[PDB]
Amino acid sequence: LTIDWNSALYHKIRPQDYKNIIETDQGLLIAEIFPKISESSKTPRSLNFALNNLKPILYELIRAHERFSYRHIINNICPKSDTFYSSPKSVIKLLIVCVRKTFPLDLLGSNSNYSVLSKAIAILVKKPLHSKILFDELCKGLRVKDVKWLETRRLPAGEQTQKIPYYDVKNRQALLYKLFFWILSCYVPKLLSTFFYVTELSSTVDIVYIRHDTWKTMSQPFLKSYFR
């Protein structure tokens, strides 16, 4: 399984449409993340509880996304500079910061798992245009035990030290990786496309990030000449 990023980088692109970074229709959002699972009428009930545990988290994520100024944070992390391109390191910090300030903590579970996200975000941007990426390489340190909305057991006071069955832990691994896949192949590339026009210098520097306004100023004289 791969993330063909160039197509993921120019699909449903809405430049500076900072509201359409995340699907604000919450029913559409969960079908986005869990395509078949979230409308199957034959889902195992352990999973149906997992999705139910997810309903408040996705709701909060949508609320945070709508009270956030993405124009603000990019002017801090990646302001207009002498260099006309934004350094990947600045693009890194910007993305990670955006996640840290809007994502509920129970979405990926722990900071440990959000580090695995941070590392995944670092690998991604550094890779050039038209580059397939092995997804399972990125799920490096994902602990399915740190994420509570996948814990559907409700045990009596005594026997709390119960070991999780293999079928159970394998199912939660699938769900978490399906959500992680949506973060990296849907959410992250849509954040990038909204802030930056992305391109390549065609040479050794095969990954370039130029702010959309800076890009529009730089192309204006070219578009202004068209008379052929």
Amino acid at 228: R
Q: How was this structure determined?
A: X-ray
Residue 192 CB: number of other CB atoms within 10 A? 22
Return d(Cα 199, Cα 23) in angstroms, integer: 25
Return d(Cα 178, Cα 123) in angstroms, integer: 19
Return d(Cα 146, Cα 128) in angstroms, integer: 32
Q: Residue 209: in which H helix or E strand, if any? A: strand 208-211
What is the DSSP annotation of 144-204?
TTS-GGG------SS---PPPPHHHHHHHHHHHHHHHHHIIIIIHHHHHHHHEEEE--SSS
Domain that holds residue 120: 2-224
Return d(Cα 123, Cα 146) in angstroms, integer: 23
Residue labelled with tokens 């449903």: 12
**Could you tell me the CATH number of the domain that includes residue 28?**
1.10.132.70
Q: Which of 208, 53, 182, 74 is nearest to 129 (CA)?
A: 208
Domains in the chain: how many in total? 1
First vs last Cα of the chain: how many Å apart? 45
Return d(Cα 86, Cα 32) in angstroms, integer: 30
What are the backbone dihedrals phi and psi of residue 213, each rounded to the nearest 5 degrees, phi first?
-70, -45
Data resolution in angstroms: 2.7
